[PDB]
Amino acid sequence: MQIFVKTLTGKTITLEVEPSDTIENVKAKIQDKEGIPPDQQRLIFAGKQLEDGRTLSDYNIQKEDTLHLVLRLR
Ligand SMILES: [Mg+2]
């Protein structure tokens, strides 16, 4: 399924994912597309800060949901 990850400027990063993909895996996909190291990425959905070891399904993320990406220096 596709999900969207919005950056601070409103850019959409579209990812192809499965419900059993982890947040670690999502950050790896973002690194591959955008070149941003996973350790610099913070993902948020429905007000929750998303933990690397949990899955999309653990957060009830569904097709075409919009996550937010916030970045940190390092
Ligand atoms: Mg896969």
Residue numbers in the entry: 1 to 74
Task: Give excerpts from the publication.
The covalent attachment of ubiquitin (Ub) or Ub chains (polyUb) to cellular proteins is one of the most versatile known post-translational modifications, with numerous signals being encoded by different types of Ub-Ub linkages. Recently, Ub phosphorylation at S65 has come to light as a novel and important component in the PINK1 (PTEN-induced novel kinase protein 1)-Parkin pathway. In its native conformation, parkin is autoinhibited, and phosphorylation of both parkin and Ub by PINK1 at a conserved S65 appears to be necessary for complete activation of parkin’s E3 ligase activity. In addition to S65, phosphorylation of Ub has been observed at several other residues, suggesting that phosphorylated Ub (pUb) may play significant roles within the Ub-signaling system.
We also present the first crystal structure of UbS65D, which reveals the structural effects of introducing a single negative charge at position 65 in Ub. The structure of UbS65D was resolved to 1.2 Å. With the flexible C-terminal tail included, the UbS65D and UbWT structures superimpose with a backbone RMSD of 0.56 Å for chain A of the two-chain asymmetric unit and 0.94 Å for chain B. Removing the flexible-tail residues R74, G75, and G76 decreases RMSD to 0.50 Å for chain A, and 0.69 Å for chain B. The backbone structures of UbS65D and UbWT are very similar, even in the loop containing S65. Elsewhere in the molecule, the greatest structural deviation is in the C-terminal tail, which is likely a result of the tail’s flexibility, as well as in the β1/β2 loop comprising residues T7 to G10. An examination of the polar contacts between Q62 and S/D65 showed noticeable differences in the backbone environment of Q62 in the mutant compared to UbWT. The side chain oxygen (Oδ2) of D65 in UbS65D is 0.44–0.47 Å closer to the backbone amide nitrogen of Q62 than the S65 oxygen in UbWT. At the same time, it is 0.94–0.95 Å farther from the backbone carbonyl oxygen of Q62. Furthermore, for all three Ub variants considered here (UbWT, UbS65D, and pUbnat) the crystal structures predict a polar/hydrogen-bond contact between the side chain oxygen of residue 65 and the backbone amide nitrogen of Q62, as well as a hydrogen bond between the backbone amide nitrogen of residue 65 and the carbonyl oxygen of Q62. However, the chemical shift differences between UbS65D and pUb are nonetheless very striking, suggesting that the phosphomimic does not fully reproduce the chemical environment of the pUbnat conformer in solution. Given the role of the protonation state of the phosphate in controlling the conformational equilibrium of pUb, the inability of aspartate and glutamate to adopt a (−2) charge on their side chain explains the observed structural and spectroscopic differences between phosphomimetic and phosphorylated Ub and suggests that phosphomimetic Ub is a poor structural model for pUb.
